[model samples]
Target: EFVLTSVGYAVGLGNVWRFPYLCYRNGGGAFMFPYFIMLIFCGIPLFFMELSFGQFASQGCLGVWRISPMFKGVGYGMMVVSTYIGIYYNVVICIAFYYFFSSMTHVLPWAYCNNPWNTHDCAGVLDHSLQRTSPSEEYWRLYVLKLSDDIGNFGEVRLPLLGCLGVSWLVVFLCLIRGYFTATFPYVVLTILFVRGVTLEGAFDGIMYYLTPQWDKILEAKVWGDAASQIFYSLGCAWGGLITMASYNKFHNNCYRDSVIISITNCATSVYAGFVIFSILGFMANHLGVDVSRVADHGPGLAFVAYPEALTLLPISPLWSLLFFFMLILLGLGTQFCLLETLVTAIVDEVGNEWILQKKTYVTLGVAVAGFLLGIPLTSQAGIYWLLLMDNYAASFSLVVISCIMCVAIMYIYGHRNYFQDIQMMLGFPPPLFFQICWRFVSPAIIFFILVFTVIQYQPITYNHYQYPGWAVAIGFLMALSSVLCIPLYAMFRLCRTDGDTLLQRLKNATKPSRDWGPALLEHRTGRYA
Candidate 1:
């Protein structure tokens, strides 16, 4: 159940759209070169580190960091950033929800083929039966559409995108509104469908795209970094999701197995999801005049633009379009709901008191509203840049830093060999000797290098790259720094208050474990100097 929950949380909208297009754009065959490298150097190792850390400390990211109490700052910082990431993420989902409902239309709103703004086909006409010729019966006269394409003058394109995001948000809201039971239950069913979907016709192409390593792409260091980033982000390693979910498990539960299952399942889901998406892309490409390779490139626009345009060529175009979008809705909603629950739980845990907000309902509602409002930018065109920055920098970097820190803590502070013993015993088997060098020296070094490389590559060559004024590199750092720094800060505060002199005082007064992650802070029952 724990593994499934994490898998549900990790394999989300990215699987449906982002990862597929990213694979294509970065080099259909070449991207995987760096991807697998990262999996070995960063993803797999970090997975072990995080799960082991959680189990050893038997604490959430926040509390674990608070082991010395000074490190508590790391936990709080992660929560705030994770909270923000979750907020905008919901906005995107809300937009999907709006689209899912709209797609059920006997006539889809604002479609392009039949529109007056369109030249070739009536944008609104679902079927391609509109008048193709001019008034004089001149066949194929070109009509120029003004304002529609740019400002969403085309319905088939823009409307569905917005509508889908909205529908996704609503689905998430409903599941989350009811709290844990309603939200996570569907993961079991969704995973089943996801596995089935991958087995469909075009799935092989997607898997091939994922695994095909373009050796030539390896020259670019960013390629390796991109691969690492994808694995980290996709796996939700340092996203605080893992820490939060693990916190929910019982103390006696073998968290190592739970983490392994989740990590393995997460990886499997990504591979499987590739087939589900590419299979559709494959069939869609054949239907269209274009080749799959041609249509397989780019980002979020792939689903909204490429897939829709591809749909126009198929025999049962509308049905296929509806089915494709439906899959997206399921994938998106499952992720959104899980993330929402994580955010709600984080807030409740932070509050550390029972009476006022403990019910979970109030927290859910609060998250829904806050998340919804924060998402409006996602609905805006310019907001795409904001989305890009947040997704790339905050979420990505936080995970990297967290993972790096975990490696250091485990190997140096906690003893890497000891942690491996814990993992091996939990698995009922012993890991080989090489696992030691890989986890300790290799993984952390590779990840740190990637992080450094990315900063160098993306450094401010221009104002737009910085996304702020010329002097704002410091500001950007501060923006990223502000939340992350707070983790240790908060941990210190909790420890200072909770640390006690006497054994009795410490037992009775130490900061108590609020959820499964252990005491929020160690309590100090007796007076200082006792």
Candidate 2:
């Protein structure tokens, strides 16, 4: 069940929304080669590493950092990333719930141009036109978000959406409190929707476009980079949830097997979802008399706008809309549940230990309340801007850097032989030499290159042609640095505290694992204490 929950947690909105659009933009069918390559060399290894580390140490994210006191900040960095995600992600759920509620009619609210929210310029119901603004786009912006000009404005809250926002958080809280059964809803609902979407008229055209290979695009470096990043984010690595969830497993559980299954399943879900998303996009294009490129959008727009608009064209639009939005609710809540658990687990592990663990219910409630309070800002009219800023800065680069650091710390700082020996202790045999080679050389070098290339190729973040201000970009940078700086800052703090005759000696002492760095088994392994 823990493994299943972890799979559910990993396979979230990104799998459904982001991957499909990326496939479209990248080399379509050719993109799969790079994507699956990443899953093998990058995603699986990291997934297995986190699972093994947490289960072996029998500690949540923060406590697992006891392996090296200097790297404790990596755990804290994970917590920080998880905290930001927990706050803003539920706002997306709020958007979905609003749509879900609106779907409880014979006709979907955004289906026609008659709604008060629709501007005079809104076009398309049956004879879809490209000249005017899309009804779906207007509904998402004017009706649903009531968005402001940019991140500078910080507009007032839309009261009804704010109410729904509160309800969304409450739903997340209730789902987490109730446990696994509710978390599985997204998986089941998504499967049903995928089946329905593929069976729709014009669906085959979309699938063909989605799968057609762009052989030239496959040669581009950016496509490969995007493929690797999609794997990382989609599988929910470097965010501590993987570690936190795996911590509950028995010390000797087969995390290697778990990692292979979960990672492959996650990528497969992303590919399957691409078919569902693009099929709808194909339907819209056929109806609108435009290319599929014009109809398809990435990220939030893909889910809330394109698909909803596509649904409006079909017979029994209401049923499809209801199922679609309901699936969104499930997806958002499922991921948010793991993120909140990651934070809560990190806190209790770092602070009160057994006492806090004993008061699990109270701790869970406290975490939920704090998350809800922190999320209030996202309910504002300009909240979408804030959410975009946070989303752009909070996770992406920081996670990559942390993942790179983790590989270096474990393979080099902790020594490759020692780390492999620890794995052997858990699994009763050493990992294959290929994984050891990947850990020592391949993984870190590729991650570092990606980070460097990303920096070199960086452009100022923008949304809908509105470039963010220098001040806003700076703030976003700081949010990223807040998590990343913890790594070195804690190392420096450890360095200062270490009593050594020389700087190198002090570094060694600080990098060494604490006295309590092995399995939490009643009978300890011999010669295993670091």
Candidate 3:
């Protein structure tokens, strides 16, 4: 159950839209070089670290910080990361909900250029190129998003996703109240679409586009940085879901085995979903008389604009349409549950579980409802900007810093012998020396380098050709800093409050585990743990 939950959380919206687009946006096949490199050194190592970390103590993200109490703020940072990440997470699901509803239109609403939403520039079914936008693009931008002139526009709350967002929150609330969940139905449809895509006229060319390498792309620091962040994002690391889920496992669960299994599954699915996406993109480009790159877009545009156009070419378009978006809804909701669960678990653990358990309905409702309201801006005409900013800045930069600090805190401050011993107690054997080198040296060093590299070569956030104004760029950074500030701020706060006769003494004391830190149940609480 726990492994399935981990798998479910790890394989999400990022796989379908994110991975494919990042590949397209960066180096196509070249992106895989850094991706696999990061996965081996950073992704799986950090994954196992969190798994053993959580299983040993059986704590939520915040509670697990008892491993190093001064960096307890790392737990707080985890929560902030999840909250901001979850906020945008729901927006993605709500988008699927909107598309799910829209999929029912008799002709499939995006199939033609004749709808009121379409402008004179709307491409005909036989039309081609960016000189005229496709019907799907115009429909999504003009009708669905009703996109604003700029980030500054902050257009009025659009009703479609607003109501759908409410429905999404309600579904999330219902799931939480009962307490429970993996994913399947999506994969069956995946094979169906994969077959559908590969058998298409021009799909062979498209598949090559996805796989054909551009080795020089690896020379770029940002590609390396993106590969690292994408691994973290795709694996659901640093967002606390991994720490959150494994913390619930049986004390003896083989999380080392799980780390390898789910990491491969998650990355493989991203590669699999990329095939599904670009095969159709290749076909769409063929029909439109353009290159695969022309029809290809990133993130929401791929899901909403590009994929739906591919659906337009199918025999029973609406049936395929519903299945596709429903697949997205499944993937999105699966990840949302874990993200919300991470937040809900951390908050309850922080407030005292017994107290919150009695009022959890209200607490869950409060968190879910507050999240819904927080999602309001995403429903704005410029809502996509908000989601984009949050995606690029809010979660991306903050995650690396927090993960880097977490590695140092747990390994350097908390002591590796204690950590490895903690793993030994849970798994009956120590992890191999490979993890040791990765954990102690390469992983953190690589992550720190990426973080510093990203800062030095920082690119202003963009939406297509449009660069966001200075104030919006500042706002984006401020959102990033808000969560990151929690770490040091809490460290300072913790050091001041901790009792010690001298500064060094207090520092040492603050690094020690809190009194209650141990396995959740007493039976597995071994010699020193007691």
Candidate 4:
């Protein structure tokens, strides 16, 4: 059950929407080469490390950092990432809820040009002629978002959108107050949708475009870099929740095997989703008599515009739209649950166990209320821009940085030999030599490259072709630094507190694992020596 829930959590919105688009953007089949490589070298190993440490220590993200006190800041960083993620991630759910409600109508508003929101230039129906905009695109921009001209605008909040946002947070709160639930309706629906999609007249062409390799793209550094980032994001690595989720398992739960299964399942889910996404895209292209490239999009555009527009062309379009958006809601909710739980678990672990554990429901209520209130900015007319800025800066790059630090802490600061010994004590055997080698050398090196490459390849943030103003970009940067800065700041704080004759000894003392660290379960207890 734990493994299954973990897999569902990992295989969230990213696998469905982000990975398929990245595959198309990067090189289709060529993208998978680096993707699989990163998964093996980076994703799976780090996954196993988190599960093993959490289960062994019986601690959440912050408590698990007892392995190396100086690097405890890494845990704080994860908590910060999870906190912001929990707040903004639900905003996506709000969008999905809005779509779902709109789909309940007899005729989808985005499907026709008759609506008040539709522009004169709106391509009323799918046509081959070069039209600048589609009805669905206009609906998303003008009706749903009512987006401001650019990121610089701090426009008044949209009341209806705010209502939907509140409903979305309410849904999440209801789900979380129950504790550790996972959803699977999306996969079943997706499989059905995929089957229906491939049967459409032009479905094969879309699949071909999705899978057919362009070998030249493999040489591009950005492809590999994007592949690595997608792997990290899609697998839910370094997101702070994996450790907390696994912390409840028995001492010898065979998490090594669980990690392999869950990680591979996540990759497989992404691949499966590509077929579902592109076959429909192929159909849309066939309907429009245009190449799939024109219809293809990234992020919210793909989910809200292209796909919904395609559905509107089919018979009983409302039913299809409802199902599709409902699936999206379930996917978003599953990931959001994990993120919120990560934050709540980290807080309880940090503040102490008794009261929180005793009043779990109250704690959950408080967290949910706080998160909902914090997310109000995202419900404004310009809320979509804020969401984009936070999504770009808050989660992806900062997560990679934290993940790199975690790998170093476990392999170097905490000592790989002792780490493996602890694993052996839990599993009654050690991981293969290859895992040890990767943990020590391969994973951190590749992650550092990705981070550096991200810096070199960085560009000023933009949305819908509007460049974010300096102030907005600065806030985004601050959001990122908010989490990452915890690493070194806490290290310095630890160094200051430690008593030593010299700086080096003080450093050593701070880096050492806690004296009280050991198996949480007495029956399986095996002591550590440092």
Among these predicted structures, which one has the highest TM-score? 3
Off by over 4 Å in 3: 1-10, 120-130, 180-184, 296-299, 353-356, 458-466, 520-523, 527-530
lDDT of 4 by residue, 119-236 (tens): 6766655433364456777788888878787666768888877798788878888877765224466566666666677777888888887776777766555666667777777767
Order the candidate numbers by TM-score, best to worst.
Answer: 3, 4, 2, 1
lDDT of each: 0.55, 0.73, 0.77, 0.74
lDDT of 2 by residue, 394-511 (tens): 7766777788788888887788888888888778889987788788778888777766766575563422223667787789889878998888888788788789967978877887
* TM values, all candidates: 0.70, 0.87, 0.91, 0.89
lDDT of 1 by residue, 369-488 (tens): 666666654555444445555665566566667667756755675455555655553345665565667777888777777767766766446424323443434544555676757755
> Residue 371 in candidate 3 has what lDDT?
88
Model 3 agreement with the true structure over 1-530: per-residue lDDT tens digits: 34474437455788877777677776567787888888888878888887788787776676677667788777777778788887888888888888888778678877777777677766656322355566777777777888877888886888878898999889988998897113566666667778777877788888887787787666567888778788888777788777777766887788788888888788778878887887877776776677877664554466666677667767888988887787678778877876777677677767775666688678888988788889898899888888877888788757777887888888887788988887888777787999988989998888878777766766544322237787877888798899889888988998888888779899888888878887888787768966
Against the true structure, whose lDDT is highest? 3
RMSD of each: 8.4, 3.6, 3.0, 3.4
Q: Cα deviation of 69 in candidate 3 (Å)?
A: 1.2
